[PDB]
């Protein structure tokens, strides 16, 4: 996360680390929607040309962590994955369209001060909250800067990182890249000409872009970090997968397989 800051312990309990088993490296962010279903970039799981055909056996998920690696005892719980459901119209050959993934835990995660689900948008919320210029919070253990300035070890935050970002006018973004910004994505970033710089970096891919409703006081995962502009990609704005636009598909899966 670029020009992000450290997160107050608890500030986003929904945050999940998606871990590789062998070897052990951080792999991606991942939101938690209920004590059994969790949400991630599909690309975080199955991107071949970066060698990714991950399966339920290869991965863990790490719930309610702060320190990126201090195995925080009596706080973080380690869930095992029972199955990974990948939007099936997601085709890693074309583009980032439908970059979405649902992961079912084997074991219902206990909630604590640090583990606790995120709400999801209803069409109602989308339309009032997802506006050109409204800011939304992205949290992650992605790297802190351009990858051969200073030293891997610096640049790899030691606790979870936080950054809010304005939503971008659909033309403004669309114009900004030769990648198709589909129906099913949105863009977050500060004004091109701007005085902060905030963004998400590869490692951050998979976690939650989130906004808090002022009407009912709740935290809604409008997006997934799908391809931030932070760090090495250094394109113009970050694309997020539109969570709502895919709620129909989300339910199709849970109901079928919950």
């Amino acid at each position: 996360i670029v020009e992000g800051w450290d997160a107050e312990k608890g500030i986003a309990p929904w945050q999940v680390m998606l871990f590789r088993k062998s070897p052990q490296e951080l792999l991606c962010g991942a939101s938690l929607i209920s004590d059994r279903w969790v949400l991630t970039a599909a690309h975080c799981i199955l991107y071949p040309p970066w060698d990714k055909n991950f399966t339920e056996n290869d991965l863990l998920v790490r719930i309610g962590k702060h320190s990126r690696t201090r195995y925080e005892r009596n706080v973080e719980k380690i869930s095992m994955l029972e199955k990974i459901y990948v939007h099936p119209r997601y085709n890693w050959r074309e583009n980032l369209d439908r970059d979405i993934a649902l992961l079912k835990l084997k074991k219902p995660v206990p909630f604590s001060d640090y583990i606790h689900p995120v709400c999801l948008p209803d069409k109602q919320t989308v339309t009032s909250l997802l506006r050109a210029g409204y800011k939304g919070r992205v949290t992650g253990w992605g790297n802190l800067r351009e990858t051969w300035t200073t030293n891997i070890n610096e640049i790899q935050p030691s606790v979870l990182q936080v950054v809010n970002l304005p939503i971008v006018e659909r033309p403004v973004c669309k114009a900004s890249t030769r990648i198709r910004i589909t129906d099913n994505m949105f863009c977050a970033g500060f004004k091109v000409n701007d005085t902060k710089r905030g963004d998400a970096c590869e490692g951050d891919s998979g976690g939650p872009f989130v906004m808090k409703s002022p009407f009912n006081n709740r935290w809604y995962q409008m997006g997934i970090v799908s391809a931030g502009a932070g760090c090495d990609r250094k394109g113009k704005y970050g694309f997020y997968t539109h969570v709502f636009r895919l709620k129909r598909w989300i339910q199709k899966v849970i109901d079928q397989f919950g």
């Binding site: 059994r36 606790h116 800011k135 808090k212 709740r218």
Partner: protein, 43 residues
């Protein structure tokens, strides 16, 4: 908060979702949240 999925298959969590044990659950706010609030000028 009028829920969606089936408590039974979705898993426990929906009813009290999106409200933070250490934060919303005490009215207490987080270093940067007023930032978010104040971004909501449209409508």
């Amino acid at each position: 908060f009028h829920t969606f999925f089936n408590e039974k298959t979705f898993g426990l969590g929906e009813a009290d979702c999106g409200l933070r044990p250490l934060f919303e659950k005490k009215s207490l706010k987080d270093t940067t949240e007023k930032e978010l609030l104040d971004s909501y000028i449209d409508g």
